[PDB]
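Following up on my earlier message about chloride ion. Here are the inputs again, as you asked, copied directly from the submission form:
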Amino acid sequence: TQTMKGLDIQKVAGTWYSLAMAASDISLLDAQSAPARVYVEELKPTPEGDLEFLLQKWENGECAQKKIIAEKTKIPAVFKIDALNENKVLVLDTDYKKYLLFCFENSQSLACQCLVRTPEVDDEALEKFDKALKALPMHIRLSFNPTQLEEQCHI
Amino acid sequence: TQTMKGLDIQKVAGTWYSLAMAASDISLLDAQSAPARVYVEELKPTPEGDLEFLLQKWENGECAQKKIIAEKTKIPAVFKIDALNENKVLVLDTDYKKYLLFCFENSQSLACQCLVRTPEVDDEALEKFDKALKALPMHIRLSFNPTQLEEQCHI
Ligand SMILES: CN(C)CCCN1c2ccccc2Sc2ccc(Cl)cc21
Ligand SMILES: CN(C)CCCN1c2ccccc2Sc2ccc(Cl)cc21
Ligand SMILES: [Cl-]
Ligand SMILES: [Cl-]
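Thanks, got it. Here's what our run produced:
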């Protein structure tokens, strides 16, 4: 939809925090176990330029660990998930050292996140997140406080 | 917190739609039966200047009807609910004919709504809602589409 020009994927490696989330549909986020309520722990680019995500997900009554690889495409900012469905991960913007904005898109519904490196509310990153979101048909948004950011599944 | 100057309460009577909702805590809105997921049907000012609300609420697996009176205070924009808890309704802004912004506050947690007269997405009213919200510690926001606005409990 809107993407990071000149993305250097190797430089997104490491720790991240899902500071804020937004989605096209309320049901994607408005339950503790909602489909898009997915918490990023780490991004692990592969030497071949795929992007592995370490995630948490509340499911069947607890906070489960998940590990998913999004495969590279010819566009550096766009990755594809191997599944029954054809979903994409799009990297909208990042400065590598503080924030990264991305969206998960199907083939439609959209969930986006504002990721930050540290458990702090970064108003500048959130401002960039909101600017990105005005071009998208979002209907739910939420953000987490520093206490929650240090808990499993942001409880 | 922030209020409508010169509110004429009699002029808020009639049909309204909860176009958007925001709250201080994610748990107040992030479930179909969450405490602040309350849908406004009608406002009925009394001759004595109290404000009755006709509402819907998803509870015990369906969309229940609710009727609550908020009693006047010496401030025209602030009403008080008779309960074990001391909660207030604050009217932030309205033009009577298109939109009304209000907040429910306890003694703390806050839920606010953008009400509109018709089942339409009013970007100007939502812009006013967002401006009001930047002065408040909100962590979840959602908005409804015209199809949902015509359904019981916005399903
Ligand atoms: C259940 N899980 C194993 C799948 C996670 C899918 N998923 C996802 C995929 C690849 C990289 C990052 C993410 S976060 C995310 C946020 C919103 C939505 Cl809707 C989906 C995702
Ligand atoms: C269960 N129900 C009978 C009580 C509704 C209480 N409540 C409320 C009260 C008076 C006038 C309007 C409202 S809407 C609302 C929005 C958010 C929250 Cl948190 C509370 C309320
Ligand atoms: Cl939104
Ligand atoms: Cl918000």
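One observation from looking it over: Residues A 28, 35-36, 38, 53, 55, 57, 66, 68, 70, 81, 89, 104, 111 surround Z80 (ligand 1) (CB under 6 Å). Hope that helps, and feel free to reply on this thread.
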